[model samples]
Target chain A: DDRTLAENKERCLQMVAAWNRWELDGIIKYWAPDVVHYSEDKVVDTDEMIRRMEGGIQAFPDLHLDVKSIMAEEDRVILRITITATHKGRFGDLAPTNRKVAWHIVEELRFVDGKVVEHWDVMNYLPMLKELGKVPADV
Target chain B: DDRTLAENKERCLQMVAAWNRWELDGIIKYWAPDVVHYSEDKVVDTDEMIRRMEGGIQAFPDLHLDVKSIMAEEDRVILRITITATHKGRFGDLAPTNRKVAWHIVEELRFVDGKVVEHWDVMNYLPMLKELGKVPADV
Candidate 1:
C-alpha cells in the first residue's frame, strides 16, 4: 500500500513538474483520452481539462503544487494538494486580478493502465471566488 | 472541543433516529426550508429530496441508522453512519431479493442556522456492489 501511495505521488509530482514548466503536452499525456474531471457539479472532458490547465499555467506562471498527503486504495489515488497560483489569465467567466491565491485541492483519481481515467475534484471554489471578489464573503 | 464534538454527535444521532422512525415530518423539520441537500454529485431541492428519500423508506422498511463517529471542525460536522436495511423493493433499477444489506454511508454536513446547508457524501460503492453479489470475485 505504501509503495502504491509513493508511486501515485511520484506520478503526480512528475505531472506537476511538466505543468510548472508549461509543457501542456507532457502533462496531458498522463490523462486518458476520455478522462472525466469533475469539480462540484461541473464535469469537463479531457479537452476542456487541457484548456483550463493551460489557462492555469498562464495565470499562475509560477504555480506551485505541494502534496500534503497521498493515499492510495487499490486503483484509486487520493491526493491532497496545496495550490498557490497568481491569477493572470481567465478562470471561468472571471478575469484574473494578478493576485496570489492559496487553497487546497483534494483529487480522487481512478486510473486505468497507468493513465487517469476519471477524477473527482474537491476544492474550495467559494474561497477562490471570494478572493477574486466575484462572490460575496458569506456565500 | 470535546463538548462541541459531543454536541455534533448528538445532533447527528437525533437526525438518524428521526430517519429510522420514519418520521418524515420531523426529518424535514430538521432541515431549513432553504437547506441545500447534496448527493449523487448533484444538489437537490427540498421537495425532490423528500421524494428521493421516500424510496429508501419503502425499500428498507425496517432500516436502522447508527452513528459511528462525529468530528466537529469549526462550522462543519462530519458524521459516519451505517444503515442496516432489509431490501424489500427496488434500488437503482435492481429488483430487491428481500435480503439484508449492511452498508455505511459517510456524509459531511455543513450547518448554518441549525440546518444542514451543504452535504458531502463519500462511500464504499464497490464494496456494497460486491456484497450484493453484483460483481464476481476475481480471486
Candidate 2:
C-alpha cells in the first residue's frame, strides 16, 4: 500500500513538527492506541514519552525538529531527525540539572492501519548526560 | 504430508539419535543442498555447520541429541533439542577437555516445497562453557 506508506511519511512529518512545537496533545494523537514505542535512545515507556515531551518544553520550549530524510516502504517509515532542545530536568532517573543540549535522533516507525504500531529508535543518551556533566566519568 | 506434531518430534529425535550413533551419513541426507543456517549465538554457514558436526564426532566420539519438543506454527517449525556428549577431543574452539556437557539447543526450521530450506539455531553457549569451566561467568 504505497498510499499508506505516503500517509505514514506525512504523519511522521506532522508528528515531528508537533513535537518540535511542544504540542503534546497533537503529538500523541498521531500514535495508535496500542502503539509500541520502542525508543532505542533510552529505556522509554508511554509515560516517559509524555514526560520527555514535557521536559523538552521546560528546557528549550521553542526548539524544533530538523528532519533530514523520510524513507517509506510499504507500512514502515524511517525518519532521520535532529532535535535542538535544552535540558532542564533529570537525566537517567537522577536529580534535575538544568542544562541545554541537542541531539541527532533516528527512528523507524511501522504503521498498521494508518497508525504507528511499532517503533525502532536510536539516539545518543549517555553523551548527552556526560555533556551535561551529570553522568559519572566512568559511565 | 499430513504428519502429526508428535510424529515430527519423533522424526527429529530419531534423526539426532542416528547422528549420535556414528551415522553421520544418514544425517547428511536429511539436510537440503541449499540449506541456510542463521543464529544469534554465532555466525554459521554451510561450511561452519559441517565443521561443527565433524568436530562434535571427533570430540565426543559418542555424542547424543535428545529432542524434547516440536512446535509448528503457520510457516515455521521449532525443534527443542538437548545435546549430551562426552568430551574426547575439541568442541567449539575449546581445548580438549575430558569432560561431559549437557547443552540445550534450539533449531528453527523453515520449510519450502515440503523440505527445510532455511534453519536458524540458538544454543546455550556460555552455560555449556561454564559447565566445562571454560568461561568464568556468563555476562
lDDT of 1 at B135: 43
In model 2, chain B matches the true chain B with a TM-score of 0.78
Tens digits of per-residue lDDT for model 2, B34-86:
87876542347887887777876897786777765455533455554667777
Model 1 agreement with the true structure over A1-139: per-residue lDDT tens digits: 5576567657777876776677877767888877888753358766777776776677677788776545454566655566777888866566778888876555667777678887766554334556877643542
TM-scores of the candidates are 0.48, 0.45
Question: Where does model 2 exceed 4 Å of error?
Answer: A1-139, B1-11, B41-43, B92-95, B137-139
Tell me the DockQ of each model, to 2 decimals: 0.04, 0.03
Candidate with best TM-score: 1
Q: List the residue pairs that clash in candidate 2.
A: none
Q: Which residue pairs does candidate 1 place in steric collision?
A: none
